[PDB]
Amino acid sequence: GFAWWGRTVYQFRYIVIGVMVALCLGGGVYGISLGNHVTQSGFYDEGSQSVAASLIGDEVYGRDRTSHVVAILTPPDDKKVTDKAWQKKVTEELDQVVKDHEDQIVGWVGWLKAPDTTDPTVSAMKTQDLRHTFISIPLQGDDDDEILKNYQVVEPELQQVNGGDIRLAGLNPLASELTGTIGEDQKRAEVAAIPLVAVVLFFVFGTVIAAALPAIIGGLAIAGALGIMRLVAEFTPVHFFAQPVVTLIGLGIAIDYGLFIVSRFREEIAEGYDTEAAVRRTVMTSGRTVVFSAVIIVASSVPLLLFPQGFLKSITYAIIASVMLAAILSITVLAAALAILGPRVDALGVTTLLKIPFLANWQFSRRIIDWFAEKEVERGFWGRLVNVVMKRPIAFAAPILVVMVLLIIPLGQLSLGGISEKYLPPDNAVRQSQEQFDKLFPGFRTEPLTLVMKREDGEPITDAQIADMRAKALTVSGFTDPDNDPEKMWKERPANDSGSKDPSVRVIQNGLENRNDAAKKIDELRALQPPHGIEVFVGGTPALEQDSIHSLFDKLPLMALILIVTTTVLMFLAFGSVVLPIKAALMSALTLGSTMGILTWMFVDGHGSGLMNYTPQPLMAPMIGLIIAVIWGLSTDYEVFLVSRMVEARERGMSTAEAIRIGTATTGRLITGAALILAVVAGAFVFSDLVMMKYLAFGLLIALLLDATIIRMFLVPAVMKLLGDDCWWA
């Protein structure tokens, strides 16, 4: 089926190149503005009890705007916060800030607003030492994203208050820096990865245009990918991890596909074949493998769509778009470019690249100046290594199997959590600011559980109903009691001007003694029998996080079942055998287990955390669901890449041992190069202030290391020999 497309693309090489390069450039230009139309509210399962409770609370009593941005004020020259001159100056500055921006900021409320008020809650807003204070500045906006945009707009003028001695913390600053880490990571990649991947390509292909064709495609892929995501942003909301996911996964896999296609074309040319025959054979043999690998990634990433998390759905869209576009490019535009170039693809150097490139795209300047700066043995090595491995297959498989099984032990200690300030390095400015806020003013940052009571009849809720609901709530123990009195716990939520005072809805709330035990208390609050005609929901940040974790756990078995079944069926269709898919699934599962074990060993147990200056905190719910699919898809990708040559060798009429040796020897350098490229682009994101990005990048590069050294150098050939001729049992 691919022979027809090879003939067509050779026949219409110029037209396809022009059409698809124009499409990719247009998509990249469209996606340039993807940062403005990207949301950050996909971290929780939708349509659950907790989210329904939060929505009802927001609708009735309005949003809690007091914790948007909190500004800590420290008087200069060790002056007391009660100084009249300092108070007057800071009040005037804050009033000027508020009046300058009447849209971004609702206002500022705090002790400085009324220093003479005898309100214990407000009086607690200033430290006992009278050396610090803080103010709350609610922001306008009916959506979290719009509030974040307002905060970003008003931040530069807000930081100048008190002569710069102001510490902005809370929710909005944390979200702003969490989003800014994405830009920091993208810039770090743009600066560091491209020169190193270019150097790797130079090593694979020596100072030739073939060394640049893959990277170009990579660029185009992500460019076009971004456009698609921008388009997807007009249909459904997307999360701010779509951009990093594209720039990492799509870039790496697109460069890998381009490397494989170019290597196959060069091999065909060296063997002796017309450019038309060369392109036809590299799209039938290597192009088919690339397409099947992309389809395997798509089938391994779609099961993430089952999870209700919008973050997982957005990353699934990003992965699908990037992979599909990378495969489409590698087959059509890369093949047509190779057809146009002809045998001189490996002869000429940077000539056509410098003739007339497209300014301001992928930093092509980077690669071209990198080549400017940088003005068979592998086959034999691989053959001898695999021959030695096959000479003693069991002796090499057993130690690897046992060590990988051992690496899975720490996964038993995995713990899951939610968003927090711990997702930034300990030296981060606003993380330290919020920690100082908590230390100076403990108890002002709370995440209480909320009981939302609603009447189906619409009648106002009687006092007796709230009274006995509070009593039954006290029946459950394990809630904060700072005042040590049951009479005045489970207080009603503060009522803001925004929202409608619906008498049929009443929300009470109270903090939890320990967050870890929340999972039980939630259930104890839900199993609690509500009044006759009142429906009750349990909400709040602990409730949302626990519900997301529970939904992820509930859907994980089905997700894994679908993942295994789809990947095995796809490999059966591709290879045509029945047992190779089984062994590939087993190898992917083992690699995933080892990677998750190592990730839990370092990130959770805090082993090696000092090197990358991140605090050890439990993982977050959707991250494990995402990393499982990513690792499985990538390990299956490399398994298919390694086994495509073996299956082609067997179809060429040679023994199983000879076929596997030939395949591994031929694909050794290509696999090593692809692994190096993806490891480099992942390491570009490893040194990231976002601990979620650290999670994903470390997991990906650990999968790279395992599947590139242990799985393939020693383990896979041994297992193939042990299976013997039964590998082709179909």
Side-chain angles (χ1 to χ4, degrees), residues 135-307:
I135 57 167
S136 73
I137 306 176
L139 282 80
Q140 307 261 11
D142 56 357
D143 191 4
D144 49 27
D145 307 307
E146 176 187 322
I147 293 169
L148 166 60
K149 296 308 292 184
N150 294 20
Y151 170 69
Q152 273 173 357
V153 161
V154 68
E155 173 184 50
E157 186 174 1
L158 190 50
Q159 201 64 44
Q160 314 309 313
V161 180
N162 203 34
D165 303 318
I166 207 171
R167 321 284 306 288
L168 294 204
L171 294 174
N172 268 275
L174 167 61
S176 48
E177 285 182 346
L178 288 172
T179 61
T181 76
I182 297 318
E184 201 176 350
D185 283 358
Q186 296 176 294
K187 281 53 201 173
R188 163 161 30 252
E190 291 166 274
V191 180
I194 295 88
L196 203 61
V197 309
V199 173
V200 169
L201 278 160
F202 150 70
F203 286 133
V204 190
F205 313 112
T207 69
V208 285
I209 181 165
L213 273 181
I216 293 174
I217 297 311
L220 283 183
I222 60 174
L226 290 179
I228 288 173
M229 298 291 327
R230 177 64 177 83
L231 202 73
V232 163
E234 292 286 80
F235 301 166
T236 75
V238 306
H239 188 273
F240 67 79
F241 261 72
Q243 274 185 109
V245 159
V246 164
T247 300
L248 188 154
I249 290 170
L251 196 157
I253 69 181
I255 295 187
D256 298 320
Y257 299 175
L259 189 142
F260 274 103
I261 299 280
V262 172
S263 298
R264 183 86 200 198
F265 182 86
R266 283 172 34 100
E267 272 183 39
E268 293 291 333
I269 289 304
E271 181 146 80
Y273 273 138
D274 185 21
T275 183
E276 180 197 280
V279 295
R280 180 176 66 82
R281 273 160 140 70
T282 191
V283 300
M284 291 166 23
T285 61
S286 188
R288 157 168 180 289
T289 292
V290 165
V291 169
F292 264 120
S293 171
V295 168
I296 282 170
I297 291 299
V298 163
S300 172
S301 161
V302 290
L304 295 192
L305 297 180
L306 312 172
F307 303 119

Side-chain angles (χ1 to χ4, degrees), residues 476-693:
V476 186
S477 314
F479 291 97
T480 61
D481 195 352
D483 54 357
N484 289 6
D485 163 38
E487 301 319 295
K488 84 192 81 63
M489 51 195 318
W490 290 107
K491 48 180 211 294
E492 291 204 44
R493 179 177 182 172
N496 298 111
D497 206 339
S498 161
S500 66
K501 292 291 211 330
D502 279 327
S504 63
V505 184
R506 289 258 186 142
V507 299
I508 57 177
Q509 45 191 5
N510 200 344
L512 269 172
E513 177 66 30
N514 203 17
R515 162 74 170 81
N516 284 47
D517 293 315
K520 174 162 42 62
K521 305 311 183 333
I522 289 302
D523 291 20
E524 280 173 350
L525 282 189
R526 284 169 177 171
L528 171 143
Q529 288 307 291
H532 182 74
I534 297 169
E535 165 172 66
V536 166
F537 303 88
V538 175
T541 315
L544 278 76
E545 297 167 343
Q546 286 319 116
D547 278 334
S548 47
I549 293 162
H550 171 57
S551 178
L552 184 68
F553 284 168
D554 186 74
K555 284 297 182 182
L556 198 48
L558 183 63
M559 197 268 273
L561 171 83
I562 284 293
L563 186 65
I564 291 169
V565 172
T566 58
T567 307
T568 288
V569 168
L570 284 189
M571 284 186 228
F572 152 71
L573 294 174
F575 304 159
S577 65
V578 176
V579 72
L580 277 70
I582 308 284
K583 84 154 182 63
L586 284 173
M587 302 275 158
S588 298
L590 206 54
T591 291
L592 173 57
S594 287
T595 308
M596 301 275 318
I598 296 178
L599 289 170
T600 302
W601 166 68
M602 61 175 48
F603 285 106
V604 177
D605 293 288
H607 281 296
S609 68
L611 198 48
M612 327 310 300
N613 69 287
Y614 66 92
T615 187
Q617 64 284 299
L619 273 64
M620 91 185 308
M623 270 312 325
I624 71 178
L626 156 65
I627 204 156
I628 296 169
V630 164
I631 288 184
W632 191 284
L634 189 63
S635 84
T636 57
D637 264 357
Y638 296 121
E639 192 96 349
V640 171
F641 294 155
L642 177 56
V643 175
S644 297
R645 306 304 310 252
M646 306 173 177
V647 298
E648 300 154 43
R650 203 90 180 71
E651 303 173 28
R652 280 156 181 167
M654 328 180 287
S655 177
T656 303
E658 191 77 2
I660 186 174
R661 192 269 301 279
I662 291 299
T664 184
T666 54
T667 193
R669 224 181 201 291
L670 320 184
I671 294 283
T672 312
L676 269 170
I677 294 310
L678 183 62
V680 160
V681 69
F685 289 90
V686 165
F687 314 117
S688 165
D689 273 18
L690 199 67
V691 179
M692 282 147 268
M693 214 58 238

Side-chain angles (χ1 to χ4, degrees), residues 1 20 38 49 122 164 318 321 329 385 427 429 468 540 613 652:
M20 201 95 78
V38 65
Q49 213 183 10
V122 173
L329 292 169
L385 188 153
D427 59 350
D468 52 359
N613 69 287
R652 280 156 181 167

